[PDB]
UniProtKB/Swiss-Prot annotation, chain A:
Coiled coil: none annotated. CRISPR (clustered regularly interspaced short palindromic repeat) is an adaptive immune system that provides protection against mobile genetic elements (viruses, transposable elements and conjugative plasmids). CRISPR clusters contain sequences complementary to antecedent mobile elements and target invading nucleic acids. CRISPR clusters are transcribed and processed into CRISPR RNA (crRNA). Cas3 and Cascade participate in CRISPR interference, the third stage of CRISPR immunity (Potential). Involved in crRNA production or stability. Disruption phenotype: Mutants lose phage DMS3 infection-dependent inhibition of biofilm formation while there is normal biofilm formation in the absence of phage infection. Decreased production of crRNA in the presence or absence of phage. Disruption of the entire Y.pestis-subtype CRISPR region disrupts crRNA production but does not alter phage resistance (possibly OLNs PA14_33350 to PA14_33310, and the flanking CRISPR loci), indicating this CRISPR is not involved in phage resistance. This is CRISPR-associated protein Csy1. The gene is csy1. Belongs to the CRISPR-associated Csy1 family. It comes from Pseudomonas aeruginosa (strain UCBPP-PA14). In this bacteria, Y.pestis-subtype CRISPRs do not confer resistance to phage DMS3 or MP22, but instead are required for DMS3 infection-dependent inhibition of biofilm formation and possibly motility. Interacts directly with Csy2; part of the Csy ribonucleoprotein complex with a probable stoichiometry of Csy1(1),Csy2(1),Csy3(6),Cas6/Csy4(1)-crRNA(1). A Csy3(6),Cas6/Csy4(1)-crRNA(1) subcomplex is also formed.
Length: 108, 228, 335, 335
DNA sequence: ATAGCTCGATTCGAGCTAA
DNA sequence: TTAGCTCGAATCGAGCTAT
């Protein structure tokens, strides 16, 4: 539960930067998560990107973050073979549940 | 001030001085023999036991690296599957008959290496204990990586007596074993005054060399070699 | 005491090239050398939400909102020209030999024992029955995986190159040769004995395999699929990309060799579904259910270890399968 | 008492260049100076579980779950064009000489005696047997490591480039001069004194070696492989990486020079394997073992001290091994 | 515990004989 | 391999010191 706060605290300090930092040209800029990384780009683009956050309601960034944290767990076959990875997946499912819950009602 | 000698390490000061800020200052240089590890500018108000504490962390990191990179090879005793490690022993040298092996069911006990291309040998418990007795590694066997191979050899014709600096690796207050000269002399059954002649440096009057039997028995008693 | 090596890597035998794709008309196949290559094109698509929901998305308030903004994708496709109805593929296949010799080994006594084990097999049973089923997989266009599932007529041409010029030409018809029956034929035995010549190391074998399939006027062909890094936008996701070597849709070489390996029939489960590829633990990616389980001790490793270490020779019928995996090679031998 | 030197760093002789690979068709190798280079491209693969399991993953539920979660990785692949069947590899080889002189040596007494020992060897016999076996490895496509195991016709052309121009040309058949025996040939002996003059130090010598091989149309070529830092995603794992200099697949210089080093037939073990490279302790990477172990006293280091310190020279075939390792170069002495 | 000294007695190596 | 023997040189113990 402490991981998603500092993840949100990370997105807190991206809100203080330039409104259109992610709108610059670039070959690789992680546009899949750009709907949540830059909330202030909706003010610059009234219809080009404001409705993109409204229409899509990005919640798969948490799925991308879930794949990242899967690299942060110990790669032990004993945990996967036994039920140790079961409740670890149960706590992974629930902790990403209210984490993703914040992102959909960000437009309010 | 004075050059602080901590076992094989020697913190020598700069002959000239400097005034960083307004206070007097000197450059203290840590040495591992002919190897220079650090220069640290320190005041003249510090005592020797405080410059020693200032340079202690680099020495501790050096000792950690030396213990890790010269750790003896570990052998593993496993069942007829190779998944469960029943017993592990650190060895100074591998068994003579090791070949690339994957455990099977026809033998109950297998002696595999800890390296991922696991060499192995089918053994029983009695032969495993014979190999463990013959091949075991002493607790301070990592100090042999910091010593030349011609001072650790058991062949008397190819053996060279260790120098004073190579002797400071295993005996002394700031040595890698931590035993004093009096304790080392008591382990060799000789007087401390004669061992101080072994550990004497730069004093050409009355400086002696250790013998083959004394050196190897000392390495036996300190836990560095020949303690299988 | 002899034991298996820690590393037992084998090189791959019967290595095929990358099968190109060119399009043309039927009965023009005798002059299909300069046929135009199949080029991958681009289509922008959208799709309604059709995947199975998780019982929490089934509310009509948000299910109707799901189809308000359906996902947009940009898919790569491979289609024939309008004035073309025949798909032509071409690749070369070599037969190397030396199945029992590993590229890398650890135990010298185990390597010698494995060589003696495969030496007794060759004299007792030559590289013939495996070579026959390798000829059938060359005969029918199984390497056209889904490019022949509804094809009216498929013809396969197999040539033999010695000094840059064709020596013996083999022509088969794939519709007559089923994917489930491994029969006997005089033309296939001529091909099979050539495979046996390469497998035994007698001589060099280089086969140019050209297959023609009748699909339709301007339909879609199905080449190998690549991977997408997915770093773009959510509208131009580029969810599909097809294999192409030089502006020409093609098939992976391991895709061709996968179908050429589909000779394993003898797995202890029921064989009504058909043959499978010779692999350790007898697995195909289509069903996700592996035959030859280690619990039933009919896998590669249990059969290989018993036949070499314990000298437990199995029947003649499964030892065709342990050598077959030595043909494809592998990285056999764990820590 | 003539103790050995603590540092004995030796410069390496027979320095090869990177072997650039370009492609084309046979019978055009006389004008092969504009052949298109073998390009490095990317393809995606997937595989099944073909490795041994640690007695716990052999459960049918766990094994099938691994098949349901496939390992998708991309690999580096190099292939010939579909209209090209000839692979040429071009590297330059320069012979230096002065093999007895070390770059670093502490004891001046040891350097004088070592130079005296090398000079005593040269007067008894020159670098003739050494260069004969070196030219034999140049005669065959041994440096064309895995592209020769299935070559139908492989041919080399060696040119003596003295003043930037062909002073003397050579043309050999690599399949005829096999990688098993070192016989005698008049044209091979003509090459022998060219390297022998370079090894002796009479004058500057530089060679260019181009090896054409009949591979096949679109077949898989094998350049030298690279290391992967293993930082990206598991789907884009890049499990294989090949060596290229400028959009052209190439072979490492030390990979080429290792094959030219393969002249050691004098190791005490049985000759079922054949010649190996001349490096101390006789290490064979593929077999994971070491011929000329120090226990039976036939490695480089014990022979060197016997020859130099206590003056007991080894056998004449063992003296070839010592000088070949001296030509090979290394960081000798107590490091 | 470090560092080093002197002084007379004991040990030590490499010659040698003696068998 | 046993069984010794000189002869100068290095080592050994036990006295003292110094830091």
């Amino acid at each position: 539960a402490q991981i998603c706060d500092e993840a949100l605290q990370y997105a807190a300090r991206l809100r203080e930067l330039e409104p259109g930092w992610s709108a610059t040209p670039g070959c690789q800029l992680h546009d899949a998560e750009q709907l949540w990384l830059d909330p202030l780009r909706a003010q610059t683009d009234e219809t080009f990107l404001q409705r993109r956050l409204r229409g899509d309601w990005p919640a798969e960034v948490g799925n991308r973050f879930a794949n990242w944290l899967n690299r942060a767990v110990s790669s032990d076959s004993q945990i996967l073979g036994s039920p140790e990875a079961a409740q670890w997946s149960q706590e992974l499912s629930k902790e990403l549940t209210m984490f993703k819950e914040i992102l959909e009602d960000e437009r309010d | 001030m004075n050059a602080i000698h901590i076992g094989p390490f020697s913190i020598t000061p700069a002959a000239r001085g400097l005034h960083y800020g307004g206070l007097p200052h000197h450059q203290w240089t840590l040495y591992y023999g002919p190897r220079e590890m650090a220069i640290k500018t320190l005041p003249d108000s510090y005592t020797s036991s405080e410059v020693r504490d200032e340079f202690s962390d680099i020495i501790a990191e050096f000792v950690i690296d030396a213990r890790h990179r010269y750790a003896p090879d570990v052998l593993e005793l496993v069942n007829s599957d190779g998944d469960a490690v029943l017993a592990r022993v650190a060895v100074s040298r591998l068994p003579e008959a090791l070949s690339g092996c994957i455990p099977d069911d026809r033998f109950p006990y297998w002696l595999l290496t800890a390296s991922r291309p696991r060499l192995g040998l089918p053994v029983t418990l009695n032969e495993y204990t014979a190999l463990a007795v013959e091949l075991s590694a002493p607790p301070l066997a990592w100090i042999t990586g910091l010593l030349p191979g011609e001072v650790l050899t058991h062949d008397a014709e190819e053996w060279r007596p260790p120098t004073s600096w190579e002797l400071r690796h295993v005996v002394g207050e700031g040595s890698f074993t931590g035993v004093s000269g009096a304790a080392a002399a008591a382990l060799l059954g000789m007087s401390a005054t004669n061992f101080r002649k072994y550990t004497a440096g730069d004093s050409a009057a009355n400086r002696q060399k250790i013998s083959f039997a004394a050196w190897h028995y000392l390495l036996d008693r300190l836990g560095v070699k020949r303690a299988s | 005491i002899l034991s298996t090596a820690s590393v037992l890597a084998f090189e791959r035998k019967l290595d095929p090239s990358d099968a190109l794709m060119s399009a043309g008309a039927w009965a023009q196949r005798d002059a299909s050398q300069e046929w135009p290559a199949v080029t991958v094109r681009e289509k922008s698509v959208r799709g309604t939400i059709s995947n199975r929901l998780k019982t929490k998305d089934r509310d009509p308030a948000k299910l109707d909102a799901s189809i308000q903004s359906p996902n947009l994708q940009t898919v790569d496709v491979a289609n024939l020209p309008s004035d073309a109805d025949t798909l032509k593929v071409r690749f070369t296949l070599r037969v190397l030999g030396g199945a029992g010799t590993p590229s890398a080994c650890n135990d010298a006594a185990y390597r010698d024992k494995l060589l003696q084990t495969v030496a007794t097999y060759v004299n007792d049973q030559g590289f013939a029955e495996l070579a026959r089923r390798y000829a059938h997989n060359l005969a029918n266009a199984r390497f056209l995986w889904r490019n022949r599932v509804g094809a009216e007529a498929v013809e396969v041409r197999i040539n033999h190159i010695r000094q840059g010029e064709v020596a013996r030409a083999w022509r088969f018809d794939a519709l007559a040769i089923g994917l489930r029956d491994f029969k006997a034929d005089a033309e296939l035995d001529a091909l099979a004995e050539l495979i046996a010549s390469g497998l035994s190391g007698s001589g060099h074998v280089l086969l140019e395999v050209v297959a023609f399939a009748r699909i339709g006027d301007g339909q879609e062909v199905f080449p190998s699929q690549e991977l997408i890094l997915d770093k773009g936008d959510k509208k131009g996701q580029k969810s599909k990309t097809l294999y192409s070597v030089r502006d020409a849709a093609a098939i992976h070489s391991q895709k061709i060799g996968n179908a050429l390996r589909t000779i394993d029939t003898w797995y202890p489960d029921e064989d009504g579904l058909g043959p499978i590829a010779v692999e350790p633990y007898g697995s195909v990616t289509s069903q996700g259910k592996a035959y030859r389980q280690p619990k039933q001790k009919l896998d590669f490793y249990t059969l290989l270890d018993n036949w070499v270490l314990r000298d437990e020779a199995p029947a003649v019928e499964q030892q065709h399968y342990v050598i077959a995996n030595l043909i494809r090679g592998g990285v056999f031998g764990e820590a």
